[PDB]
Write a protein that binds this ligand. Structure first.
Ligand SMILES: C[C@@H](C(=O)O)c1ccc(-c2ccccc2)c(F)c1
Ligand SMILES: C[C@@H](C(=O)O)c1ccc(-c2ccccc2)c(F)c1
Length: 133
């Protein structure tokens, strides 16, 4: 169930995040700070509304959405985007569209860990989170 995603997750591994951030035009000073943060992802539900928070020493984000229903998102870097989150093959797929561009944030559970794959053009970043109590 989507319920297996719920809770508090701490970053334990990251691959190619700098490439992903460069692909979105994130400036070098922000990429430097973000390369060292170890954010917390919190996923909560109330009926069919999910809330996904990310917390770090650099930045906070939060979105709420109904699965399979489009929402407007102002991203952390002030992209004004059209978004949707869905379950697809048991993975939580978050698609953002703006200016004919797309990025996907795909979350899945493997051996109790949460694996986030971030794709924008050719850039693919894999980030691994472990559950907190
Ligand atoms: C989910 C969280 C994380 O990976 O821990 C996160 C936070 C912000 C971003 C982000 C947001 C705006 C531009 C570039 C990257 C991200 F890709 C992932
Ligand atoms: C990964 C996460 C974090 O460190 O908390 C994060 C959050 C915000 C950003 C971001 C990205 C571009 C502009 C402003 C902020 C990021 F690159 C990474």
């Amino acid at each position: 169930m989507v319920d297996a995603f719920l809770g508090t997750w701490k970053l334990v591994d990251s691959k190619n995040f700098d490439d992903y951030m460069k692909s979105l035009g994130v400036g070098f000073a922000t990429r430097q700070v973000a390369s060292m943060t170890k954010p917390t992802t919190i996923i909560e539900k109330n009926g069919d509304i999910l809330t996904l928070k990310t917390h770090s020493t650099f930045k906070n984000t939060e979105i709420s959405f109904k699965l399979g229903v489009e929402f407007d998102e102002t991203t952390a870097d002030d992209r004004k985007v059209k978004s949707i989150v869905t379950l697809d093959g048991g993975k939580l797929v978050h698609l953002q569209k703006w200016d004919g561009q797309e990025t996907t944030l795909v979350r899945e559970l493997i051996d109790g860990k949460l694996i986030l794959t971030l794709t924008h053009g050719t850039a693919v970043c894999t980030r691994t989170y472990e559950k907190e109590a």
